[PDB]
Write an enzyme that holds these catalytic residues in place. Structure first.
Site, PDB file in Angstrom:
ATOM      1  N   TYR D   9       0.731  -1.671  -0.427  1.00 46.56           N
ATOM      2  CA  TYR D   9      -0.265   0.020   0.170  1.00 46.56           C
ATOM      3  C   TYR D   9       1.060   1.273   0.449  1.00 46.56           C
ATOM      4  CZ  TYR D   9      -3.956  -3.205   1.179  1.00 46.56           C
ATOM      5  OH  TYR D   9      -5.090  -4.005   1.089  1.00 46.56           O
ATOM      6  N   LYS D  18      -2.745   9.549  -9.859  1.00 44.93           N
ATOM      7  CA  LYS D  18      -3.883   8.213  -9.782  1.00 44.93           C
ATOM      8  C   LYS D  18      -4.748   8.608  -8.687  1.00 44.93           C
ATOM      9  CE  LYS D  18      -4.447   4.597  -7.557  1.00 44.93           C
ATOM     10  NZ  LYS D  18      -5.414   2.937  -6.640  1.00 44.93           N
ATOM     11  N   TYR D  19      -4.400   9.632  -7.800  1.00 44.51           N
ATOM     12  CA  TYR D  19      -5.359  10.125  -6.673  1.00 44.51           C
ATOM     13  C   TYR D  19      -6.439  11.125  -6.946  1.00 44.51           C
ATOM     14  CZ  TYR D  19      -3.553   5.749  -4.625  1.00 44.51           C
ATOM     15  OH  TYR D  19      -3.927   4.588  -3.657  1.00 44.51           O
ATOM     16  N   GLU D  77     -13.361  -2.709   3.527  1.00 45.09           N
ATOM     17  CA  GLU D  77     -12.413  -2.652   3.576  1.00 45.09           C
ATOM     18  C   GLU D  77     -12.474  -3.999   3.979  1.00 45.09           C
ATOM     19  OE1 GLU D  77      -9.369  -2.535   1.194  1.00 45.09           O
ATOM     20  OE2 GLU D  77      -8.817  -4.708   2.355  1.00 45.09           O
ATOM     21  N   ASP D 104     -16.544  -7.453   3.290  1.00 45.84           N
ATOM     22  CA  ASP D 104     -16.426  -7.655   1.770  1.00 45.84           C
ATOM     23  C   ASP D 104     -17.642  -7.463   0.985  1.00 45.84           C
ATOM     24  OD1 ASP D 104     -16.621  -9.394  -1.065  1.00 45.84           O
ATOM     25  OD2 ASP D 104     -14.547 -10.486  -0.116  1.00 45.84           O
ATOM     26  N   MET D 105     -17.301  -6.590   0.251  1.00 40.33           N
ATOM     27  CA  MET D 105     -18.581  -5.740  -0.674  1.00 40.33           C
ATOM     28  C   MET D 105     -19.469  -6.578  -1.045  1.00 40.33           C
ATOM     29  SD  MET D 105     -16.926  -4.279  -3.954  1.00 40.33           S
ATOM     30  CE  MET D 105     -15.221  -4.061  -3.580  1.00 40.33           C
ATOM     31  N   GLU D 120     -10.666   0.896  -6.507  1.00 36.45           N
ATOM     32  CA  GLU D 120      -9.869   0.965  -7.672  1.00 36.45           C
ATOM     33  C   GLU D 120      -9.321  -0.522  -7.268  1.00 36.45           C
ATOM     34  OE1 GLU D 120      -5.633   0.525  -8.057  1.00 36.45           O
ATOM     35  OE2 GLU D 120      -7.624   0.144  -8.785  1.00 36.45           O
ATOM     36  N   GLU D 129      -8.241  -8.082 -11.628  1.00 36.18           N
ATOM     37  CA  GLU D 129      -8.331  -8.742 -10.011  1.00 36.18           C
ATOM     38  C   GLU D 129      -9.430  -7.784  -9.807  1.00 36.18           C
ATOM     39  OE1 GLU D 129      -5.777  -5.001  -8.127  1.00 36.18           O
ATOM     40  OE2 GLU D 129      -4.498  -6.051  -9.080  1.00 36.18           O
TER      41      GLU D 129
HETATM   42  O1  LIG Z   1       1.672  -3.141 -11.999  1.00 39.66           O
HETATM   43  C1  LIG Z   1       2.142  -3.395 -10.864  1.00 39.66           C
HETATM   44  C2  LIG Z   1       3.440  -2.977 -10.576  1.00 39.66           C
HETATM   45  O2  LIG Z   1       3.975  -4.327  -9.799  1.00 39.66           O
HETATM   46  C3  LIG Z   1       4.822  -3.718  -8.285  1.00 39.66           C
HETATM   47  C4  LIG Z   1       5.979  -2.865  -9.024  1.00 39.66           C
HETATM   48  C5  LIG Z   1       7.286  -2.752  -8.426  1.00 39.66           C
HETATM   49  C6  LIG Z   1       6.616  -2.315  -6.945  1.00 39.66           C
HETATM   50  C7  LIG Z   1       6.051  -3.802  -6.570  1.00 39.66           C
HETATM   51  C8  LIG Z   1       5.578  -3.642  -5.313  1.00 39.66           C
HETATM   52  C9  LIG Z   1       4.911  -4.547  -4.475  1.00 39.66           C
HETATM   53  C10 LIG Z   1       3.839  -5.470  -5.542  1.00 39.66           C
HETATM   54  N1  LIG Z   1       4.247  -4.923  -6.872  1.00 39.66           N
HETATM   55  C11 LIG Z   1       4.426  -3.451  -7.350  1.00 39.66           C
HETATM   56  N2  LIG Z   1       1.307  -4.965  -9.990  1.00 39.66           N
HETATM   57  C12 LIG Z   1      -0.252  -5.054 -10.120  1.00 39.66           C
HETATM   58  C13 LIG Z   1      -1.305  -4.302  -9.937  1.00 39.66           C
HETATM   59  O3  LIG Z   1      -2.069  -4.562  -9.392  1.00 39.66           O
HETATM   60  C14 LIG Z   1      -0.836  -2.278  -9.242  1.00 39.66           C
HETATM   61  N3  LIG Z   1      -1.983  -2.149  -8.611  1.00 39.66           N
HETATM   62  C15 LIG Z   1      -1.453  -0.179  -8.215  1.00 39.66           C
HETATM   63  C16 LIG Z   1      -3.082   0.248  -7.191  1.00 39.66           C
HETATM   64  C17 LIG Z   1      -2.263  -0.254  -6.237  1.00 39.66           C
HETATM   65  C18 LIG Z   1      -2.931   0.351  -5.294  1.00 39.66           C
HETATM   66  C19 LIG Z   1      -2.706  -0.122  -3.718  1.00 39.66           C
HETATM   67  C20 LIG Z   1      -2.348  -1.075  -3.332  1.00 39.66           C
HETATM   68  C21 LIG Z   1      -1.834  -2.316  -4.843  1.00 39.66           C
HETATM   69  C22 LIG Z   1      -2.197  -1.301  -5.545  1.00 39.66           C
HETATM   70  C23 LIG Z   1      -1.815  -2.546  -6.878  1.00 39.66           C
HETATM   71  C1  LIG Z   2      -5.519  -2.593  -5.006  1.00 38.29           C
HETATM   72  S1  LIG Z   2      -6.341  -2.119  -4.060  1.00 38.29           S
HETATM   73  C2  LIG Z   2      -6.077  -0.003  -3.851  1.00 38.29           C
HETATM   74  C3  LIG Z   2      -6.717   0.604  -2.441  1.00 38.29           C
HETATM   75  C4  LIG Z   2      -6.574   2.057  -2.271  1.00 38.29           C
HETATM   76  N1  LIG Z   2      -8.172   2.293  -2.916  1.00 38.29           N
HETATM   77  C5  LIG Z   2      -5.380   2.799  -2.836  1.00 38.29           C
HETATM   78  O1  LIG Z   2      -5.921   3.111  -4.031  1.00 38.29           O
HETATM   79  O2  LIG Z   2      -4.421   2.800  -2.126  1.00 38.29           O
HETATM   80  C6  LIG Z   2      -7.788  -2.255  -4.000  1.00 38.29           C
HETATM   81  C7  LIG Z   2      -7.949  -2.899  -2.587  1.00 38.29           C
HETATM   82  O3  LIG Z   2      -9.065  -3.672  -2.323  1.00 38.29           O
HETATM   83  C8  LIG Z   2      -9.307  -4.267  -1.550  1.00 38.29           C
HETATM   84  N2  LIG Z   2     -10.703  -5.139  -1.730  1.00 38.29           N
HETATM   85  C9  LIG Z   2     -10.451  -5.881  -2.994  1.00 38.29           C
HETATM   86  N3  LIG Z   2     -11.318  -6.568  -3.285  1.00 38.29           N
HETATM   87  C10 LIG Z   2     -12.575  -6.374  -2.031  1.00 38.29           C
HETATM   88  C11 LIG Z   2     -14.128  -6.736  -2.206  1.00 38.29           C
HETATM   89  N4  LIG Z   2     -14.437  -7.441  -2.416  1.00 38.29           N
HETATM   90  N5  LIG Z   2     -14.469  -6.134  -0.658  1.00 38.29           N
HETATM   91  C12 LIG Z   2     -13.913  -5.143   0.599  1.00 38.29           C
HETATM   92  N6  LIG Z   2     -12.187  -4.950   0.067  1.00 38.29           N
HETATM   93  C13 LIG Z   2     -12.131  -5.630  -1.600  1.00 38.29           C
HETATM   94  C14 LIG Z   2      -8.530  -5.025  -1.235  1.00 38.29           C
HETATM   95  O4  LIG Z   2      -7.884  -5.788  -0.313  1.00 38.29           O
HETATM   96  C15 LIG Z   2      -7.121  -3.896  -2.016  1.00 38.29           C
HETATM   97  O5  LIG Z   2      -6.961  -3.217  -0.161  1.00 38.29           O
END
Ligand SMILES: O=C(COc1cccc2cccnc12)NC[C@@H](O)CN1CCc2ccccc2C1
Ligand SMILES: C[S@@+](CC[C@H](N)C(=O)[O-])C[C@H]1O[C@@H](n2cnc3c(N)ncnc32)[C@H](O)[C@@H]1O
Ligand SMILES: O=C(COc1cccc2cccnc12)NC[C@@H](O)CN1CCc2ccccc2C1
Ligand SMILES: C[S@@+](CC[C@H](N)C(=O)[O-])C[C@H]1O[C@@H](n2cnc3c(N)ncnc32)[C@H](O)[C@@H]1O
Lengths: 310, 303, 322, 322
Positions: D9, D18-19, D77, D104-105, D120, D129
């Site tokens: 994270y 992104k944000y 979450e 879980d959603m 996201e 995903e």
């Molecule tokens: O494109 C990538 C890049 O992967 C990485 C690239 C570089 C460092 C990483 C470290 C830990 C995990 N992944 C890494 N991963 C797949 C995609 O799901 C990325 N998203 C991007 C958005 C996001 C936000 C919060 C938590 C996780 C994520 C993961």
């Molecule tokens: C890739 S992350 C993005 C996190 C955050 N929004 C950000 O941008 O930093 C997706 C998040 O959704 C949560 N998540 C995924 N599927 C879910 C579900 N079915 N119900 C609740 N939470 C979920 C994951 O655990 C993860 O923390």
């Protein structure tokens, strides 16, 4: 809120004790979030608790409070997470609370304290497996005992003898102590070893009887003389954390549990009352000295509940 | 010199505590990841629905600090092998939870006691955690040289301590670890945090542990004696053992409060660093062989 | 998660005792729920849950004309291929006394509640075919005073010596999977060249309906087997017993085996390494029944006279799909 | 089915674009749903679905004070470890404007319907995903006129040459599994030493909410890639685009990449055997998105200029858990 008092009170209420004048002593810990601490509170108006603005006195302690007890009318003896036993003294005006001693003598969380009958000594119990005898005037440990083989759960001073107290551990032992003896502890309890002992209370009159609660929700009544278990009841559905006798002539027994309930039992362990008022663990009970049918419990839900007991 | 950590079972504010121990000289801290008294409930209402937070936030430290300075500790109320079913179930769930949090945090190590004979279910839970994702982090089992029951004072009138000869019995503790580690199928992730006591057991009991995966040795303040100038030191015997442990390059861990009051916690530590600097310098063979200890090679085959 | 083949239903429909026993269970239960003076006025609603090709529906029909009582039948089956057979039975023979339902019993939204559910979802170790989870997800349509047949089942284990079977398991190594996976899964096997080291002991038990406020199907159990010869432990035979209704039972536990019933062979739980046991010693074993929302599995270990590795940690080698 | 680590994270919260882009999406959407004359009277209910450590909750809060509009927030979450961070944020800072929900959603029974859900849940190939399945199981608590942010996402594929990457995949053989499994799963990879053989083309597309009477997330798509050099095909780069709100988008498709956004690398779909393509030829590929009630997976094959084996038949080498 008085001077020196914290603006907010720690969520997890651990202890509640009425002084003879009828005022309420509260101990509370912060068991979660950023700061893991503790605080002490005095409420001359018991119905105003737990609101921090309507207290008589209040103070922050470094670490959480695992157990509490009045020394006399102005002394507060504290079992701390820090390894410390501390004595806090009450104000002259009784409007602030002041550390008198903080001794770092136990190697782990101090989990239990009791004041001995005279009022001049105390025994503490720790997760460090030790049991310690304190000189409160001198601020020192006189005696240190490793009787047990797992962390100590409860220590209770006999109502009338400075050298006799009960202790109970996760090592499955209840020990009757008498420091007059060369070998002070003596193992007591039912015929068959059972579920771990989790709470103890002496009978306030029959100075040879006590109750004990176990981790399975059973409260049991023991006689030291006939050295065997007389009565027992399945009171709770979770561990029994506290047992408190009423001030009554023939006394009632408050039973409190992690099942989030309070129960009140008679001499024969029969159920007279039960309260689900709490919605988290019930940590303590005190009987009003002023109104002998009034009973106060506190919980980890931050409720201070005043029960009316038939 | 000596890598060493402080073992605390009370941490009011993490920032502060970590600073205190770092100033004191320690390489790392062993501490709870949840409040040690914070018994949780997983099945029965209403305590089940206890509003959160369930613990203190990960934001409180840098990723790097979590990765390198912190060793988790299982909450001491978690008893997966209790005889009471409701306690066993909460304990399973609680253990998973604290284990998952350590992994979430990226802790390099995490401590769990073997403080009784039967740890079958603890083993089962840990083995499960181990096979739920592939991670590097270590599990230190905290085992004593001498079992608590065999260390107690002879102060129960009607339950005397047995002073007779017990060759096997004084090794009970090794068997606790042997069995646990067998159940867990010798995982490379499970190592020994050997707890040393005031009374060293017989030398044979210290024989048991010779080839075992000792990653840490725990030194309670209780075991240090006092010299003329009031500094903390150790009995000749305890020094011998330390010297053996230095040769195995374990990490040292100080547990308990300061009992030599007129001195800092850094004085215990200073003594250890004194002991290691005062060990015979490695001979020429030991300098050559240094990087190679228990490194397995194919034999050379020049034919 | 799989569908049984036609010839598999065929072989097992050939059991004399299994169905005769279910008939008798349904027979008694009807009598106990509808008194003589109500015989013509009270029509019991009967549900067969996992009806396969119908023998339990026929055995229900025979039980009602033997009780001289009246019943409505539902035949729920998830194997759509068997649902073919059922639907051809219900058009050609049963008529509308039987409503054939093609769905999963955990899913089916029932038009009415049942007086009695009948099921045969049992494996050689009782619950290893997920009879608990299946019936749990069905019971919401059993009336408050409803009867489940079976009402109860219990598994049993006994330690065994057999180097023959040890060797048969070992020989089950496959490419492309853990080289020791063979040893972390139970086999249905007609145990023949083996030695049983101790009397079977009860392991896991389930009751139906399940009146638990919180239903938990997971289990942990610890068994102590007194052994009085020297030998080598190679595994654990499992068996089961079930109360269909009252005194009417089915059993493959040798001491109380149902005579003539061939429908279940014993089950074998292997261990990775043979363990030497001496006369006078106790074998201690530990079994867990575990679960996800996706799967159910067993894990086991021996803790005496010596320890083994925990077998099947996580269902890494074997699970049963939900 | 796994829980993301704290440091994971951490790295991704560091993304500028992104944000800021989500803030702007929430910003516009509020304005379009609550008119100036209603600004103080209309409080929009906003739900962040999979809120991780909260940056989307903060970006919601910043969007509302930028829109000068009023919002109630829910932060759902499922990762209980992140739920720790969220719950400490909501006590120390957010106050009761944010209700933190640990579940879980797909499961959460919502006390009220939402005006807007924010999520996201997107992988480098958009839907890999399981954003569709997640949001589908949530939408029942979106109001009839409700907005999902994102509203839409689309995946893309382009064929690539790279013997370097072919060789990197090949080198991923493990013991105890199919010797060619490496080749039947997609890799997130920063494609570097490679040649892109044709322009990316859209693959799968999802819209939210999903107004389909019968929702089906499975897909079959057929792509024709005109190629104009000679070369060898080693795999398919995937990328994606998504409409957050209206004109506010995120993209890793090179032709329209969001500048500065490092949060997603491209994805690689390998093929078992290199295939020679000649100048002037078309590469034809076929992708399927497949599912169980338990898992979701892709299967792919090349059908021109020559055929390959179908990759990942059945999810035998790779699935994503539901
Ligand atoms: O494109 C990538 C890049 O992967 C990485 C690239 C570089 C460092 C990483 C470290 C830990 C995990 N992944 C890494 N991963 C797949 C995609 O799901 C990325 N998203 C991007 C958005 C996001 C936000 C919060 C938590 C996780 C994520 C993961
Ligand atoms: C890739 S992350 C993005 C996190 C955050 N929004 C950000 O941008 O930093 C997706 C998040 O959704 C949560 N998540 C995924 N599927 C879910 C579900 N079915 N119900 C609740 N939470 C979920 C994951 O655990 C993860 O923390
Ligand atoms: O004990 C055994 C015996 O296994 C077999 C033993 C002999 C022949 C078999 C042929 C096909 C499948 N299994 C066979 N199997 C496990 C247990 O679930 C048996 N039950 C017995 C009851 C039954 C009824 C209908 C459909 C299937 C079954 C299966
Ligand atoms: C072992 S068989 C017995 C069949 C039949 N009663 C007999 O004795 O010949 C169990 C049957 O239940 C069906 N079944 C299992 N689980 C089910 C479920 N959850 N819902 C509906 N049917 C199920 C199986 O497909 C199978 O045909």
């Amino acid at each position: 809120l008085p001077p020196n008092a914290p603006a907010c009170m720690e969520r997890q209420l651990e202890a509640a004790r009425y002084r003879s004048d009828g005022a309420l002593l509260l101990g509370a810990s912060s068991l979660s979030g950023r700061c893991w601490a503790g605080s002490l509170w005095l409420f001359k108006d018991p119905c105003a608790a737990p609101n921090e603005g309507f207290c008589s006195a209040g103070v922050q302690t470094e670490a959480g409070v695992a157990d509490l007890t009045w020394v006399g009318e102005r002394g507060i003896l504290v079992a701390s997470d820090s390894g410390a036993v501390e004595l806090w003294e009450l104000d002259e005006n009784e409007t602030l609370i002041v550390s008198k001693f903080c001794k770092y003598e136990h190697d782990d969380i101090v989990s239990t304290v009791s004041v001995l009958s005279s009022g001049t000594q105390a025994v503490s119990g720790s997760k460090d497996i030790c049991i310690k005898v304190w000189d409160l005037a001198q601020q020192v440990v006189l005696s240190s005992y490793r009787a047990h083989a797992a962390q100590v759960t409860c220590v209770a001073a006999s109502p009338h003898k400075d050298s006799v107290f009960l202790s109970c551990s996760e090592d499955n032992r209840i020990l009757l102590w008498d420091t007059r003896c060369p070998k002070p502890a003596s193992q007591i309890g039912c015929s068959a070893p059972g579920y771990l002992p989790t709470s103890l209370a002496w009978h306030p009159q029959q100075s040879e009887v006590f109750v004990f609660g176990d981790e399975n929700g059973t409260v049991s009544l023991v006689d030291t003389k006939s050295t065997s278990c007389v009565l027992s009841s399945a009171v709770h559905s979770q561990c029994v954390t506290g047992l408190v006798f009423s001030p009554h002539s023939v006394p009632f027994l408050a039973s409190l549990s992690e099942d989030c309930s309070l129960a009140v039992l008679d001499s024969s362990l029969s159920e007279l009352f039960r309260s689900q008022a709490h919605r988290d663990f019930v940590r303590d009970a005190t009987w009003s000295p002023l109104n002998h049918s009034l009973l106060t419990t506190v919980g980890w839900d931050h409720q201070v509940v005043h029960h009316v007991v038939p | 010199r000596v890598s060493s950590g402080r073992d605390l079972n009370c941490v009011p504010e993490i920032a502060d505590t970590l600073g205190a121990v770092a100033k004191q000289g320690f390489d790392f801290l062993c501490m709870p990841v949840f409040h040690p008294r914070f018994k949780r409930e997983f099945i029965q209402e209403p305590a089940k629905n206890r509003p959160g937070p369930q613990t203190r936030s990960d934001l409180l430290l840098s990723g790097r600090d979590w990765n390198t300075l912190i060793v988790g500790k299982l909450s001491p109320w978690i008893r997966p092998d209790s005889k009471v079913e409701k306690i066993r179930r909460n304990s399973e769930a609680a253990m998973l939870q604290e284990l998952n949090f350590g992994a979430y945090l990226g802790l390099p190590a995490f401590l769990l006691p073997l403080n009784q004979e039967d740890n079958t279910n603890l083993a089962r839970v840990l083995t499960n955690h181990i096979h739920t994702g592939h991670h590097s982090s270590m599990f230190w089992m905290r085992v004593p040289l001498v079992a608590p029951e065999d260390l107690r004072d002879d102060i129960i009138e009607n339950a005397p301590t047995t002073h007779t000869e017990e060759y096997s019995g004084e090794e009970k503790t090794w068997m606790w670890w042997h069995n646990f580690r067998t159940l867990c199928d010798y995982s490379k992730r499970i190592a020994v945090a050997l707890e040393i006591g005031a009374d060293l057991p017989s030398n044979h009991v210290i024989d048991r542990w010779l080839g075992e995966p000792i990653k840490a040795a725990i030194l309670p303040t209780s075991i240090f004696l006092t010299n003329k100038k009031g500094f903390p030191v150790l009995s000749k015997m305890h020094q011998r053992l330390i010297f053996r442990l230095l040769k195995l390059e374990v990490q040292f861990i100080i547990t308990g409060t300061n009992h030599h009051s007129e001195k800092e916690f850094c004085s215990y530590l200073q003594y250890l660093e004194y002991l290691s600097q005062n060990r015979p310098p490695p001979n020429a063979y030991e300098l050559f062989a240094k990087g190679y200890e228990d490194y397995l090679q194919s034999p050379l085959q020049p034919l | 998660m799989d569908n049984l083949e036609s010839q598999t239903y065929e072989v097992f429909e050939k059991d004399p005792i299994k169905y005769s026993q279910y008939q008798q269970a349904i027979y008694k239960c009807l009598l106990d729920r509808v008194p003589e003076e109500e015989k013509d006025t009270n029509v019991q609603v009967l549900m067969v849950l996992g009806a396969g090709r119908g023998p339990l529906v026929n055995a229900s029909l025979r039980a009602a004309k033997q009780a001289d009582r009246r019943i409505k039948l539902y035949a729920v089956e998830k194997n759509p291929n068997a649902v073919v057979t059922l639907e051809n039975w219900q058009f050609e023979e049963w008529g509308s006394q039987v409503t054939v339902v093609s769905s999963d019993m955990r899913e089916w939204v029932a038009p009415e509640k049942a007086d009695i559910i009948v099921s045969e979802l049992l494996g050689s170790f009782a619950d290893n075919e997920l009879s608990p989870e299946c019936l749990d997800g069905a019971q919401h349509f059993l009336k408050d005073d409803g009867v489940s047949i079976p009402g109860e089942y219990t598994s049993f284990l006994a330690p065994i010596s057999s180097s023959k079977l040890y060797n048969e398991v070992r020989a089950c190594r496959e490419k492309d999977r853990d080289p020791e996976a063979q040893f972390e899964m139970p086999y249905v096997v007609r145990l023949h060249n083996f030695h049983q080291l101790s009397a079977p002991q009860p392991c896991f038990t389930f009751s139906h309906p399940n009146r638990d406020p919180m239903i938990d199907n997971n289990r942990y159990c610890t068994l102590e087997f007194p052994v009085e010869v020297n030998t080598v432990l190679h595994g654990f035979a499992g068996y089961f017993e079930t109360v269909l209704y009252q005194d009417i039972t089915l059993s493959i536990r040798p001491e109380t085996h149902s005579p003539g019933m061939f429908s279940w062979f014993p089950i074998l739980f292997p261990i990775k390494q043979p363990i030497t046991v001496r006369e006078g010693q106790t074998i201690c074993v530990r079994f867990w029944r575990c679960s996800n929302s996706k799967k159910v599995w067993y894990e086991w270990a021996v803790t005496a006279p010596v320890c083994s590795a925990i077998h099947n940690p996580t269902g890494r080698s074997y699970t049963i799909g939900l």
